[PDB]
Amino acid sequence: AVLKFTTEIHPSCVTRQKVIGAGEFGEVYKGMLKTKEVPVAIKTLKAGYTEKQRVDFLGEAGIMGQFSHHNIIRLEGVISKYKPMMIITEYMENGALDKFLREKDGEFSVLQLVGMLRGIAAGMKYLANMNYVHRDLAARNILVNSNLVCKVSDFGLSPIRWTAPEAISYRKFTSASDVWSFGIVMWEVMTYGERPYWELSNHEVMKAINDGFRLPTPMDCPSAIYQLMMQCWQQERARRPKFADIVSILDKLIRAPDSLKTLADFDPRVSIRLP
Numbered sequence: 001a002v003l004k005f006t007t008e009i010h011p012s013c014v015t016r017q018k019v020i021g022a023g024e025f026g027e028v029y030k031g032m033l034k035t036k037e038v039p040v041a042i043k044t045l046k047a048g049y050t051e052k053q054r055v056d057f058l059g060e061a062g063i064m065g066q067f068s069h070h071n072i073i074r075l076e077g078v079i080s081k082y083k084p085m086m087i088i089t090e091y092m093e094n095g096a097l098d099k100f101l102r103e104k105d106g107e108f109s110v111l112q113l114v115g116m117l118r119g120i121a122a123g124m125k126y127l128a129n130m131n132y133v134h135r136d137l138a139a140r141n142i143l144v145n146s147n148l149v150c151k152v153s154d155f156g157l158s159p160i161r162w163t164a165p166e167a168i169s170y171r172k173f174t175s176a177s178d179v180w181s182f183g184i185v186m187w188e189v190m191t192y193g194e195r196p197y198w199e200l201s202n203h204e205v206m207k208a209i210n211d212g213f214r215l216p217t218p219m220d221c222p223s224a225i226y227q228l229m230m231q232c233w234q235q236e237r238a239r240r241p242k243f244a245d246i247v248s249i250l251d252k253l254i255r256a257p258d259s260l261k262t263l264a265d266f267d268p269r270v271s272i273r274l275p
């Protein structure tokens with residue numbers, strides 16, 4: 001029954017063109033789907049896969065079929081009746097959000113940036129309510145379409161810098177550790193894809209966090225947005241906002257946009273003195 005929320009696609013409707021990545025036991029491709037041709041991403045499961053790999057593969061397809069939300073990647077269908085098996089999703093021409101922002105430094109308004117964050121939060125609120133813990137939320141796992149709409153995904157490549165302390169220390173992954181990651185995502189967006197904690201090593205990042213340090217304000221960042229990402233990074237898990245709280249705050253800021261005009265002070269690293 002695993003594939004109940006999914007559509008089985010016939011192999012003759014799929015054409016693979018270019019390898020765009022690697023999967024658990026198979027390649028990921030960029031291709032076309034016929035149902036007039038629609039571009040798609042395709043993750044395959046090649047010959048020789050184990051029984052565990054097949055459970056995980058069709059399990060991923062099944063949970064994806066169950067999600068139906070504007071800010072979650074949409075499953076087009078699955079090939080389970082023929083070999084190689086395939087997971088087929090929509091294709092986003094703008095690609096991954098972290099690379100997208102880095103190649104478009106300074107090109108959007110703060111209202112546009114905050115709107116992207118509201119979308120990511122609505123998707124995470126939906127996942128958490130469906131009792132799905134993401135565990136690898138980060139800008140590299142989010143796709144942008146040509147309306148600037150962000151869709152939470154998981155390309156499965158796994159992230160110390162994005163992970164809540166209790167998840168690092170004793171493997172407690174929950175929707176509250178995803179909220180910690182979401183705070184880091186807010187910082188990625190407002191910095192146009194800067195690397196969290198810059199050149200600090202993984203061990204330096206954990207020691208700084210445990211000693212109470214937190215990421216400083218991005219440049220040009222609304223006070224309310226920095227306040228919100230700071231509360232995502234509370235050491236005490238039970239003190240973090242839920243995603244329902246985050247969605248609500250972001251929606252109210254956007255709908256009263258003057259609220260975003262008050263900016264947090266930025267700590268300059270360099271002093272330049274001119275007359």
Ligand SMILES: Cc1ccc(C(=O)Nc2cccc(C(F)(F)F)c2)cc1Nc1nc(-c2ccncc2)nc(-c2ccncc2)n1
Pocket residue numbers: 020021022023028041042043060064067072073087088089090091092093094095096127132134143152153154155156
């Ligand atoms: C084929 C595929 C299979 C599964 C997923 C996916 O997000 N699965 C998933 C699994 C669990 C949870 C979720 C959740 F909850 F929605 F986030 C999603 C996405 C994709 N789509 C995908 N994968 C990849 C990909 C790339 C590299 N390695 C693995 C997958 N890339 C791209 C892509 C890249 C650039 N432009 C447009 C689309 N799309």
